[PDB]
Write a protein that binds this ligand. Structure first.
Ligand SMILES: *CCC(=O)Nc1ccccc1Nc1nc(Nc2cncc(OC)c2)ncc1C(F)(F)F
Length: 347
């Protein structure tokens, strides 16, 4: 078997000429020449079978990405594993090789308004399809947006994704949460489990702001500091928006804070297109009920050059498996991963 950087990367014989790319969320990623469709591909090594959390996440991503078919959503081309459960230690996921991701691009490259507009359109186009399947991505951020050499964009990493559940969204104040801090909607820290579509719109809003300046808009250093950043720009919530927070701990915390003024978008972003800032304002609305939805965001004047609802497909069916893998142990999960990957085995 092939070795990379003191690591078994056991993908051959179909996949050869391995080049290390980097480390992703939970393991080694290489490029490799695919001897069947004669292209280089991306391959990530997943070794999840020891920890139940890794298993739940691996299974979610596999079930979701195999069901989804969309130009702005990374596919799975191939899955490599051992022929038996007993021999299966790692899973290799084979995906289109992309030039970069938005996180690497923002650290090195100024974006023209035209590039911002096209990136934003494709994020929303992919997101319309995800949300139409009753799925929440829940971890949208620049490193989960892949780009090829012609700036086509694909959403990746559905490991934290869930079926939408708006009726069970309420929780207490300062409830712990898994998804990436800087892209977390203010309601997460106040009264939300992140079980509604509005959670993803907030993250897209943060990504749009970060494309305008190359810097995260709300770079919190800890759980409650995240809220400090958001309120520093949005200013104090209105009485009406507070009245929607019924939980007393969350309400009273907000009431305890000194009054803060809204920082106008055009001061924060002096070079930005005014229509881009109108859409940003609507995505970064404090109150999740008043926050723009994906389809409304697509219809916004900023995106008029691209908007074409007949060419913005939705999913054939909602995603069935509600998230109910939560109670399943590592061993049933290994079995389910084995089953879900069976189609990529010779015959
Ligand atoms: C979906 C998130 C992810 O897999 N990101 C990531 C992170 C680090 C290394 C590799 C990947 N995946 C990935 N990368 C490329 N292409 C690429 C090439 N040169 C640099 C980078 O920096 C991240 C990425 N293509 C495809 C993938 C894929 F996700 F499909 F496996």
């Amino acid at each position: 078997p092939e070795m990379v950087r003191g690591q078994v990367f056991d993908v051959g014989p179909r996949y050869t000429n391995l080049s290390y790319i980097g480390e992703g969320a939970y393991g080694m990623v290489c490029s490799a020449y695919d001897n069947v469709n004669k292209v280089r591909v991306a391959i990530k090594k997943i070794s999840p079978f020891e920890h139940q959390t890794y298993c739940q996440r691996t299974l979610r991503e596999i079930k979701i990405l195999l069901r989804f078919r969309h130009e702005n959503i990374i596919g799975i081309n191939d899955i490599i594993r051992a022929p038996t459960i007993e021999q299966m230690k790692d899973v290799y996921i084979v995906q289109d090789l992309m030039e970069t991701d938005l996180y690497k691009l923002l650290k090195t490259q100024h974006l023209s308004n035209d590039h911002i507009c096209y990136f934003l359109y494709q994020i929303l186009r992919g997101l319309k399809y995800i949300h139409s399947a009753n799925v929440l991505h829940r971890d949208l951020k620049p490193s989960n947006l892949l780009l090829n050499t012609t700036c086509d964009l694909k959403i990746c990493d559905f490991g934290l994704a869930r079926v939408a559940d708006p009726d069970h969204d309420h929780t207490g104040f300062l409830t712990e949460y898994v998804a990436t801090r800087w892209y977390r909607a203010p309601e997460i820290m106040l009264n939300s489990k992140g079980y509604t579509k509005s959670i993803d719109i907030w993250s897209v809003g943060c990504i749009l702001a970060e494309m305008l300046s190359n810097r995260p808009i709300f770079p919190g250093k800890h759980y409650l500091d995240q809220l400090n950043h958001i309120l520093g720009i949005l200013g104090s919530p209105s009485q009406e928006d507070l009245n929607c927070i019924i939980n007393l701990k969350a309400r009273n915390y907000l009431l305890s804070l000194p009054h803060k003024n809204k920082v106008p978008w055009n001061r924060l972003f002096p070079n930005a297109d005014s229509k881009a800032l109108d859409l940003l304002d609507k995505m970064l609305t404090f109150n999740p009920h008043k926050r723009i939805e994906v389809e409304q965001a697509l219809a916004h004047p900023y995106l008029e050059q691209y908007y074409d609802p007949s060419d913005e497909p939705i999913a054939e069916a909602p995603f069935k498996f509600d998230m109910e893998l939560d109670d399943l142990p590592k061993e049933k999960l290994k079995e389910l991963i084995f089953e879900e990957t069976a189609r990529f085995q010779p015959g």
